[PDB]
Design a protein around this motif. Structure first.
Motif, PDB file in Angstrom:
ATOM      1  N   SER A  95      65.469 -13.568  38.601  1.00 52.23           N
ATOM      2  CA  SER A  95      64.312 -13.855  37.763  1.00 52.23           C
ATOM      3  C   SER A  95      64.758 -14.224  36.358  1.00 52.23           C
ATOM      4  CB  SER A  95      63.384 -12.636  37.679  1.00 52.23           C
ATOM      5  OG  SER A  95      63.984 -11.610  36.910  1.00 52.23           O
ATOM      6  N   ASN A  96      63.808 -14.716  35.575  1.00 56.83           N
ATOM      7  CA  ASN A  96      64.018 -14.933  34.148  1.00 56.83           C
ATOM      8  C   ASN A  96      62.880 -14.320  33.345  1.00 56.83           C
ATOM      9  OD1 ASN A  96      62.113 -17.210  34.820  1.00 56.83           O
ATOM     10  ND2 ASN A  96      62.477 -17.726  32.659  1.00 56.83           N
ATOM     11  N   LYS A  97      63.163 -14.002  32.085  1.00 53.23           N
ATOM     12  CA  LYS A  97      62.138 -13.584  31.143  1.00 53.23           C
ATOM     13  C   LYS A  97      62.451 -14.171  29.776  1.00 53.23           C
ATOM     14  CE  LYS A  97      59.181  -9.641  30.008  1.00 53.23           C
ATOM     15  NZ  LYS A  97      59.254  -9.132  28.607  1.00 53.23           N
ATOM     16  N   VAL A  98      61.445 -14.788  29.173  1.00 56.73           N
ATOM     17  CA  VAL A  98      61.585 -15.424  27.859  1.00 56.73           C
ATOM     18  C   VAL A  98      61.170 -14.468  26.748  1.00 56.73           C
ATOM     19  CG1 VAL A  98      60.890 -17.389  26.419  1.00 56.73           C
ATOM     20  CG2 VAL A  98      61.221 -17.683  28.878  1.00 56.73           C
ATOM     21  N   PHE A  99      62.011 -14.387  25.716  1.00 58.78           N
ATOM     22  CA  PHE A  99      61.726 -13.603  24.520  1.00 58.78           C
ATOM     23  C   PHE A  99      61.777 -14.526  23.320  1.00 58.78           C
ATOM     24  CE2 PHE A  99      63.193 -10.656  27.674  1.00 58.78           C
ATOM     25  CZ  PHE A  99      62.452  -9.501  27.456  1.00 58.78           C
ATOM     26  N   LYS A 100      60.911 -14.278  22.341  1.00 63.65           N
ATOM     27  CA  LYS A 100      60.787 -15.126  21.153  1.00 63.65           C
ATOM     28  C   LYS A 100      60.922 -14.303  19.881  1.00 63.65           C
ATOM     29  CE  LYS A 100      57.780 -18.237  23.721  1.00 63.65           C
ATOM     30  NZ  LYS A 100      56.493 -18.982  23.796  1.00 63.65           N
ATOM     31  N   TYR A 101      61.587 -14.874  18.883  1.00 64.25           N
ATOM     32  CA  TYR A 101      61.943 -14.137  17.667  1.00 64.25           C
ATOM     33  C   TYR A 101      61.829 -14.961  16.397  1.00 64.25           C
ATOM     34  CZ  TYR A 101      64.570 -11.504  21.241  1.00 64.25           C
ATOM     35  OH  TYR A 101      64.947 -10.830  22.377  1.00 64.25           O
ATOM     36  N   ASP A 102      61.315 -14.332  15.345  1.00 71.29           N
ATOM     37  CA  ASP A 102      61.482 -14.848  14.002  1.00 71.29           C
ATOM     38  C   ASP A 102      62.859 -14.403  13.543  1.00 71.29           C
ATOM     39  OD1 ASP A 102      60.063 -16.088  11.541  1.00 71.29           O
ATOM     40  OD2 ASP A 102      60.929 -14.241  10.740  1.00 71.29           O
ATOM     41  N   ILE A 103      63.603 -15.311  12.927  1.00 71.56           N
ATOM     42  CA  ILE A 103      64.879 -14.942  12.306  1.00 71.56           C
ATOM     43  C   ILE A 103      64.602 -14.642  10.838  1.00 71.56           C
ATOM     44  CG2 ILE A 103      67.260 -15.614  11.771  1.00 71.56           C
ATOM     45  CD1 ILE A 103      67.243 -17.357  14.301  1.00 71.56           C
ATOM     46  N   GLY A 104      64.596 -13.349  10.503  1.00 70.10           N
ATOM     47  CA  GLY A 104      64.252 -12.896   9.160  1.00 70.10           C
ATOM     48  C   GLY A 104      65.405 -13.021   8.195  1.00 70.10           C
TER      49      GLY A 104
ATOM     50  N   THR B  42      66.529 -10.275  13.439  1.00 69.46           N
ATOM     51  CA  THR B  42      65.353 -10.887  14.069  1.00 69.46           C
ATOM     52  C   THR B  42      64.189  -9.917  14.191  1.00 69.46           C
ATOM     53  OG1 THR B  42      66.056 -10.327  16.332  1.00 69.46           O
ATOM     54  CG2 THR B  42      66.796 -12.452  15.461  1.00 69.46           C
ATOM     55  N   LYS B  43      62.969 -10.459  14.222  1.00 72.09           N
ATOM     56  CA  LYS B  43      61.779  -9.685  14.581  1.00 72.09           C
ATOM     57  C   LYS B  43      61.242 -10.243  15.888  1.00 72.09           C
ATOM     58  CE  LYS B  43      57.011  -8.521  13.418  1.00 72.09           C
ATOM     59  NZ  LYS B  43      55.789  -8.747  12.567  1.00 72.09           N
ATOM     60  N   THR B  44      61.044  -9.373  16.871  1.00 71.12           N
ATOM     61  CA  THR B  44      60.516  -9.793  18.161  1.00 71.12           C
ATOM     62  C   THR B  44      59.031 -10.147  18.029  1.00 71.12           C
ATOM     63  OG1 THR B  44      62.093  -8.292  19.227  1.00 71.12           O
ATOM     64  CG2 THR B  44      60.364  -9.224  20.620  1.00 71.12           C
ATOM     65  N   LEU B  45      58.648 -11.272  18.623  1.00 73.76           N
ATOM     66  CA  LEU B  45      57.254 -11.709  18.631  1.00 73.76           C
ATOM     67  C   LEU B  45      56.608 -11.259  19.934  1.00 73.76           C
ATOM     68  CD1 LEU B  45      57.771 -15.365  17.274  1.00 73.76           C
ATOM     69  CD2 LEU B  45      57.333 -13.272  15.929  1.00 73.76           C
ATOM     70  N   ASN B  46      55.719 -10.273  19.842  1.00 77.33           N
ATOM     71  CA  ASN B  46      55.024  -9.744  21.019  1.00 77.33           C
ATOM     72  C   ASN B  46      53.746  -9.043  20.597  1.00 77.33           C
ATOM     73  OD1 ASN B  46      57.596  -7.169  21.321  1.00 77.33           O
ATOM     74  ND2 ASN B  46      55.636  -7.037  20.241  1.00 77.33           N
ATOM     75  N   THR B  47      53.121  -8.318  21.523  1.00 77.67           N
ATOM     76  CA  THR B  47      51.891  -7.587  21.205  1.00 77.67           C
ATOM     77  C   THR B  47      52.033  -6.069  21.393  1.00 77.67           C
ATOM     78  OG1 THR B  47      50.992  -8.146  23.401  1.00 77.67           O
ATOM     79  CG2 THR B  47      50.293  -9.522  21.550  1.00 77.67           C
ATOM     80  N   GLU B  48      53.269  -5.571  21.330  1.00 78.88           N
ATOM     81  CA  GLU B  48      53.560  -4.144  21.545  1.00 78.88           C
ATOM     82  C   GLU B  48      53.125  -3.289  20.348  1.00 78.88           C
ATOM     83  OE1 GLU B  48      55.009  -3.206  24.690  1.00 78.88           O
ATOM     84  OE2 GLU B  48      54.658  -5.329  25.123  1.00 78.88           O
ATOM     85  N   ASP B  49      53.001  -1.982  20.580  1.00 85.88           N
ATOM     86  CA  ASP B  49      52.544  -1.027  19.567  1.00 85.88           C
ATOM     87  C   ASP B  49      53.589  -0.683  18.509  1.00 85.88           C
ATOM     88  OD1 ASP B  49      50.030   1.262  20.939  1.00 85.88           O
ATOM     89  OD2 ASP B  49      50.044  -0.920  20.696  1.00 85.88           O
ATOM     90  N   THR B  50      54.843  -1.052  18.765  1.00 88.40           N
ATOM     91  CA  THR B  50      55.947  -0.807  17.825  1.00 88.40           C
ATOM     92  C   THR B  50      56.526  -2.155  17.414  1.00 88.40           C
ATOM     93  OG1 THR B  50      57.409  -0.415  19.746  1.00 88.40           O
ATOM     94  CG2 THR B  50      56.655   1.534  18.507  1.00 88.40           C
TER      95      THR B  50
END
Ligand code: HEM
Ligand code: HEM
Ligand code: MG
Lengths: 109, 110
Positions: A95-104, B42-50
């Motif tokens: 399987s795959n799962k996509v994660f997305k991030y702001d680079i602060g 990085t900051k993860t983009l999601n809808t989690e409580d943390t």
């Protein structure tokens, strides 16, 4: 801020290396305006499934979406199969799962 | 030889990602380590409580990272860092951390 998209591949045990070799030559991602960097990683110390991460770094999320919507994305993935696919039995990719991030923040020496 | 990546993953109280990220703007010695190349926060983009903040460090080798981990500069950088769970961690939004380690099998730069 830069943007990072991760595709996280859940793989059969021991299949990380053969999977990573598939990423060696570019298939057009580099042609998308806003694309900056990619890393392909193997998670160390896994005891169950292997894990490979494909990290892509972009000037914006918009740039990444542009690639997702591109013909080169489709071309790069045309012969990719999950084990679950009708013709995918031999694939080690579960399987795959996509994660997305702001680079602060970013720093380079 | 392959580059190496170490990740420290922070689980944070909701809303505290941005303030936490600002703590990384100023260098505290990591740049003096032979083998250190790059860092991303990085900051993860999601809808989690943390909130979730990841600190990704990129090295010429795992040995280089190990040298930093055991160094005086690592200790200095972290001497005032507390977890919410610490006796004196009242003002900390940091709930937990976990370290992950990776071999970098491939890299491309435009
Ligand atoms: C739909 C599930 C996906 C699977 C199973 C998968 C797996 C793969 C595989 C096996 C390759 C190498 C293909 C080959 O042998 O030529 C590839 C290419 C690639 N994949 Fe995926 N992928 C998926 C979707 C995604 C997504 C959503 C991303 C977003 C980060 C991504 C990032 C990449 C990149 C950057 C390449 C190289 C593209 C290029 O050089 O132009 N993949 N993928
Ligand atoms: C013991 C658990 C840890 C916690 C709670 C934590 C949290 C933090 C915080 C809040 C800072 C900013 C320091 C400040 O405010 O002055 C910092 C510095 C830093 N941390 Fe951690 N950290 C931990 C261990 C680690 C580990 C294992 C890594 C390996 C990736 C790491 C990577 C870094 C880096 C690269 C910096 C900047 C260092 C410099 O500029 O010299 N940390 N850490
Ligand atoms: Mg193994």
């Amino acid at each position: 801020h830069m943007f990072m998209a991760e595709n996280r591949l859940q793989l059969q045990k021991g299949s990380a290396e053969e999977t990573i070799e598939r990423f060696y030559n570019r298939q057009g991602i580099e042609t998308i305006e806003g694309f900056q960097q990619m890393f392909v990683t193997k998670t160390l110390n896994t005891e169950d499934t292997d894990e490979v991460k494909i990290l892509t770094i972009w000037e914006s999320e918009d740039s990444f979406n542009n690639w997702l919507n591109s013909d080169v994305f489709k071309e790069a993935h045309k012969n990719v199969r999950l084990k679950s696919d009708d013709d995918g039995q031999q694939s080690p990719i579960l399987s795959n799962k996509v994660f997305k991030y702001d680079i602060g923040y970013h720093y380079q020496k």
